[PDB]
């Protein structure tokens, strides 16, 4: 039994700032939710394969959360302190406690390439996001590049992402969107993130054995 309280699976696995006081447990038979948990994806967007993720996390025999890319050390040439008023906590703007909004630093957004190797002798759950701003003037101000790319390469997951700019209806005070994607990484496999903009990089991941 895993009680998420008033948080959805999305808000809990992404690390919504208003769900940090959820007691983590390494083994659960099923997940108990509520009729409509108040806190889900504080930043609007499409959660890819959400139902498949809820099925994959239904029951777990081992579950450890770990820092996959340390914030202070992984992106020295990119700004890392991005926060939003949508994902607020104690009345102050913050972001997902498992993600990182990389933006430009000193007028530049250099090409990044970050690898993670699954040395946990388990399968790790990795989550990231692709940012879809609402206009080109925001794309320039945030990243200083106009034609952004985001690619993820693993043995069993490889995809070139489409960071398209589009003004969507204002939800939670935002006309832009963050599309959330995820994959399960087998032991020994290496996932590689490459981007010149619009990447919501993974900060923490989850090593799980999935009983």
């Amino acid at each position, epitope marked *: 039994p895993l009680q998420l309280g008033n948080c959805s699976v999305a808000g809990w696995i992404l690390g919504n700032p208003e769900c940090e006081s959820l007691i983590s447990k390494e083994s659960w038979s099923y997940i108990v939710e509520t009729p409509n948990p108040e806190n889900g994806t504080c930043y609007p967007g499409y959660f890819a394969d959400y139902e498949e993720l809820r099925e994959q996390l239904s029951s777990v025999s081992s579950f450890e959360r770990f820092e996959i890319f340390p914030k202070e050390s992984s992106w020295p040439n990119h700004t890392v302190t991005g*926060v939003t008023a*949508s994902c607020s906590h104690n009345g102050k*703007s913050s972001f997902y406690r498992n993600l990182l909004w990389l*933006t*430009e630093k000193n*007028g530049l957004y250099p090409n990044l390439s970050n690898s993670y190797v699954n040395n946990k002798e388990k399968e790790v759950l990795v989550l990231w996001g692709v940012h879809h701003p609402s206009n080109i*003037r925001d794309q*320039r101000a945030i990243y*200083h590049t106009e034609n952004a790319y985001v690619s993820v390469v693993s043995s069993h997951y490889s995809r070139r992402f489409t960071p398209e700019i589009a003004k969507r209806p204002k939800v939670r005070g935002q006309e832009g969107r963050i599309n959330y994607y995820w994959t399960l990484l087998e032991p020994g496999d290496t996932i590689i993130f490459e981007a010149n903009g619009n990447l919501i990089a993974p900060w923490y991941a989850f090593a799980l054995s999935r009983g």
Partner: antibody
Amino acid sequence: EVQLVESGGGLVQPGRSLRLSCTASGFTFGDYGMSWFRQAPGKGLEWVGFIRSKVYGGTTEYAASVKGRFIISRDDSKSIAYLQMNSLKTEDTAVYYCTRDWVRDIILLPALHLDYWGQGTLVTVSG
Amino acid sequence: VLTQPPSVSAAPGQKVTISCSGSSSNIGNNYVSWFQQLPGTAPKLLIYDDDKRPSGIPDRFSGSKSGTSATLGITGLQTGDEADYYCGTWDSRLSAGVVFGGGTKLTVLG
């Protein structure tokens, strides 16, 4: 309406200190960032510094002209923004204005939505 | 720092444009704001977010940007428009912060 009123300017010797004040009225002060600008007599607009709203950390940014010497703070209980100036030099002599501004959401930059200004106060760094 | 024409002259009722050239750091990728400052007065916000207008600004004032330079347009020229005009923006370089243009004095002819 929105109204920003400034005070504190006056004669001050080089090397001394002087604390400017900017009182806000007619809007929720805690929801806006605040910026100080200055303008030497007949010599164009210059940026002094900027303080974010409490929602965005209440942190500050400063011009290279000023960073080590001036300190910007705010008091949301009294809806007042301050410009604490130290180690003043003669080239700091200018009319100083205060403004309200938006804090951009993700990059936390000032939006430069300086829709409302104070009347300004003159600071003479002289001996 | 941004560069503006020191003076701009135009007759009433004419199209008048003020240039503000910058770099990719400041004007290329950041928003530009335009200000009007009549002699000895607090500046007035004409344009923000490269073309948006705050409340009270008439439709005669417009702004545009293309690459590294930004431009402000005033279409129905009045004698009240005779003032100084500044362009401001953020410079994403390490500690350049808010940068401005030198200023442009608009004189109405006739």
